[PDB]
Amino acid sequence: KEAILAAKAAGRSRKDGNLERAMTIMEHAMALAPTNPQILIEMGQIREMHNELVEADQCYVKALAYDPGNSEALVLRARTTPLVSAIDRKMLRSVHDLRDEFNHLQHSTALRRMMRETYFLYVYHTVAIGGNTLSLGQTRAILESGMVIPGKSIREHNEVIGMDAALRFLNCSLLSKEHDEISIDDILEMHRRVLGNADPVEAGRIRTTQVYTPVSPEYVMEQLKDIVDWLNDESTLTIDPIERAAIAHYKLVLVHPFTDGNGRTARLLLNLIMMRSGFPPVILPVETRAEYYASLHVANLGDLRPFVRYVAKHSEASIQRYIGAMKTSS
Amino acid sequence: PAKVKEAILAAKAAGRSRKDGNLERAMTIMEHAMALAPTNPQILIEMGQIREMHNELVEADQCYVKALAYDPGNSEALVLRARTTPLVSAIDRKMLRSVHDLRDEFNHLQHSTALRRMMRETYFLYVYHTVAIGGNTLSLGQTRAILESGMVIPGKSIREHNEVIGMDAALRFLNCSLLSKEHDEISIDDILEMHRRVLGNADPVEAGRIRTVGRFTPVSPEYVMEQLKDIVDWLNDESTLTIDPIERAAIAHYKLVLVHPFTDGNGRTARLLLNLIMMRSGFPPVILPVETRAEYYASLHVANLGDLRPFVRYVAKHSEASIQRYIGAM
């Protein structure tokens, strides 16, 4: 346990004139229960020698969240945070420049490719991240043929169906410019469509028993109205669109107002906000599932920046996917 | 220009000349004349009289009622039906009393294993039959695999599965919430959650929801909801407790079908309400088999001409058939 703290002292001895031996020792004990800033602070440093600034800063922030007042974590972070903020501002800059670089050609192939295949990709990825064993071809087969895929449960089918319904509602009621006000009944309807076919008793329904690192208590509603008011507040136009969507998703998944269907509706609200800010559909792929959940847990420790970097990561990845998609078109 | 095939004016002039010649041949001639002009008043009159001499009084009366409804003011039909009416009223009371006695010796049955087996078993046959009248192509064995085995039939429609499931959870709700003697009432929300149960999985957006003065629309939620209020008030009024439960259920089914309060699933909810009334008067689940679908609508047809008696005879027949299924099971 605390024995290997002397191996954080061994990476302390190595770190002075070393290469990957310090990383050899710290890899080890690091995987031996990260909780004491003693190992997380030192690992932050060893990361920093590799010019891994944001990961170091993460180790410091986590050492502080677990040990409020740990002053070596405090000082090291006070030195790392401004650079990390500059880097994140840069990342958002880049993804926006790519965004309005994207808004140039409205070919019929953009219609064809994006409108259809990114629809089926979004459905498949959102339901799949929630453990759905369906493939993309099976998902679209469900959507346009309505028959049953062999070897799959009925509830998976109903997850795909409900996701399709919720997307339809979001597009033909919440993505219109004439209705520039997001109501709370709109969120309730989005969840009712998400979970309607799979679980009719709890679709569009606020949980009574608010079970459990817990979640806000039996007073969710007023917080839902808080979310809605913040979305419709006039100061939120100054905030970066990507961080706006990420904060909405965050706010929501922390409120956790439904017994089930929270993650899908959260990704839905994120996608809605980003699409109304001129962005194409943002796809959080299933292969990155791990990191996704990972970042969210860090978000519950007081640090939303990993999740923001994740959303920017895959939004820019999707946009560049598209530019590179019709650069090989022609 | 209502024109009639010539071959039957000749068949109408011929039939006028004989009955009394031992001519069964007249019945088959008038039957071939029934297959081409089913709405011809004189053919229905004659066919009725043939049914009279053949000592099938109820069907003769039916031909008279149908001829009079098709030809308002036809006094021939008026006098013939004036002869037949009291006799068929008597016959109907005979039938109802018989069904009620058989039902009284159904409630005097003491069985342990076979009974419940059968109960759960019934539990399923009802779903299959009530959805098969609705146009569901799922087999009884497929429905049974879905509900009882948690199986799924690939290559078949997803919504058929969801209709079976919704109807099953519905019947569960009726048995374990609406038959508790602590109720003894029928609120509008009982019908509304029975509908939310019927269409919950198949169509969650409109399940448990009623179909939709500055404009001029004939349909608005307050009016349709108001008609539902009239229905439930009629159901819980004590004067309507004095009528035979079979007629109470049939009239309720008719009223609910004609109010048309939901966008879809009205027929399933109507047969379900019929079953609810029947069961609260001590009857086993009344299954209207899909093999009799025709007769079903046929009776309802006569219902819209002003005669609910064929429908009452129908639901009485199949109620006795259900009871006799349970009774013959041991």
mmCIF file with all atom_site columns, C-alpha atoms in Angstrom, chain A residues 142 146-150 152 154 157-158 161 192-193 196-197 200, chain B residues 152-158 161-162 165 200-202 204-205 207:
data_model
loop_
_atom_site.group_PDB
_atom_site.id
_atom_site.type_symbol
_atom_site.label_atom_id
_atom_site.label_alt_id
_atom_site.label_comp_id
_atom_site.label_asym_id
_atom_site.label_entity_id
_atom_site.label_seq_id
_atom_site.pdbx_PDB_ins_code
_atom_site.Cartn_x
_atom_site.Cartn_y
_atom_site.Cartn_z
_atom_site.occupancy
_atom_site.B_iso_or_equiv
_atom_site.pdbx_formal_charge
_atom_site.auth_seq_id
_atom_site.auth_comp_id
_atom_site.auth_asym_id
_atom_site.auth_atom_id
_atom_site.pdbx_PDB_model_num
ATOM 1  C CA . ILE A 1 142 ? -34.997 -1.968  -38.309 1.00 0.00 ? 142 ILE A CA 1
ATOM 2  C CA . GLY A 1 146 ? -39.467 -2.594  -39.502 1.00 0.00 ? 146 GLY A CA 1
ATOM 3  C CA . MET A 1 147 ? -38.918 -6.343  -39.286 1.00 0.00 ? 147 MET A CA 1
ATOM 4  C CA . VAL A 1 148 ? -37.165 -8.162  -36.438 1.00 0.00 ? 148 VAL A CA 1
ATOM 5  C CA . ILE A 1 149 ? -33.437 -8.922  -36.523 1.00 0.00 ? 149 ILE A CA 1
ATOM 6  C CA . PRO A 1 150 ? -32.656 -12.537 -35.515 1.00 0.00 ? 150 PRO A CA 1
ATOM 7  C CA . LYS A 1 152 ? -31.744 -9.711  -30.774 1.00 0.00 ? 152 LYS A CA 1
ATOM 8  C CA . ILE A 1 154 ? -37.247 -6.864  -28.499 1.00 0.00 ? 154 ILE A CA 1
ATOM 9  C CA . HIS A 1 157 ? -35.390 -2.932  -31.327 1.00 0.00 ? 157 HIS A CA 1
ATOM 10 C CA . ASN A 1 158 ? -37.528 -0.634  -29.183 1.00 0.00 ? 158 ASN A CA 1
ATOM 11 C CA . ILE A 1 161 ? -37.362 2.820   -32.668 1.00 0.00 ? 161 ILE A CA 1
ATOM 12 C CA . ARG A 1 192 ? -41.116 9.994   -23.740 1.00 0.00 ? 192 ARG A CA 1
ATOM 13 C CA . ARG A 1 193 ? -40.128 9.284   -27.340 1.00 0.00 ? 193 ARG A CA 1
ATOM 14 C CA . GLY A 1 196 ? -41.606 5.075   -25.114 1.00 0.00 ? 196 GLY A CA 1
ATOM 15 C CA . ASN A 1 197 ? -41.494 1.813   -27.044 1.00 0.00 ? 197 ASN A CA 1
ATOM 16 C CA . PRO A 1 200 ? -43.983 2.896   -21.657 1.00 0.00 ? 200 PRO A CA 1
ATOM 17 C CA . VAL B 2 152 ? -38.937 -13.054 -30.509 1.00 0.00 ? 152 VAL B CA 1
ATOM 18 C CA . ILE B 2 153 ? -39.907 -14.010 -34.066 1.00 0.00 ? 153 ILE B CA 1
ATOM 19 C CA . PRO B 2 154 ? -37.489 -12.471 -36.599 1.00 0.00 ? 154 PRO B CA 1
ATOM 20 C CA . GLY B 2 155 ? -38.677 -11.719 -40.097 1.00 0.00 ? 155 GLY B CA 1
ATOM 21 C CA . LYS B 2 156 ? -42.015 -10.555 -38.660 1.00 0.00 ? 156 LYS B CA 1
ATOM 22 C CA . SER B 2 157 ? -43.094 -7.015  -37.871 1.00 0.00 ? 157 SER B CA 1
ATOM 23 C CA . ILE B 2 158 ? -41.820 -5.374  -34.681 1.00 0.00 ? 158 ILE B CA 1
ATOM 24 C CA . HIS B 2 161 ? -44.731 -7.985  -31.151 1.00 0.00 ? 161 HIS B CA 1
ATOM 25 C CA . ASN B 2 162 ? -45.353 -4.655  -29.419 1.00 0.00 ? 162 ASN B CA 1
ATOM 26 C CA . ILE B 2 165 ? -46.830 -7.205  -25.392 1.00 0.00 ? 165 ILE B CA 1
ATOM 27 C CA . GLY B 2 200 ? -47.809 1.732   -24.982 1.00 0.00 ? 200 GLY B CA 1
ATOM 28 C CA . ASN B 2 201 ? -45.155 -0.313  -26.760 1.00 0.00 ? 201 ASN B CA 1
ATOM 29 C CA . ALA B 2 202 ? -46.561 -0.059  -30.294 1.00 0.00 ? 202 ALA B CA 1
ATOM 30 C CA . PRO B 2 204 ? -46.221 5.458   -27.225 1.00 0.00 ? 204 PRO B CA 1
ATOM 31 C CA . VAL B 2 205 ? -46.861 9.014   -28.451 1.00 0.00 ? 205 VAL B CA 1
ATOM 32 C CA . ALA B 2 207 ? -51.066 5.826   -25.944 1.00 0.00 ? 207 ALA B CA 1
#
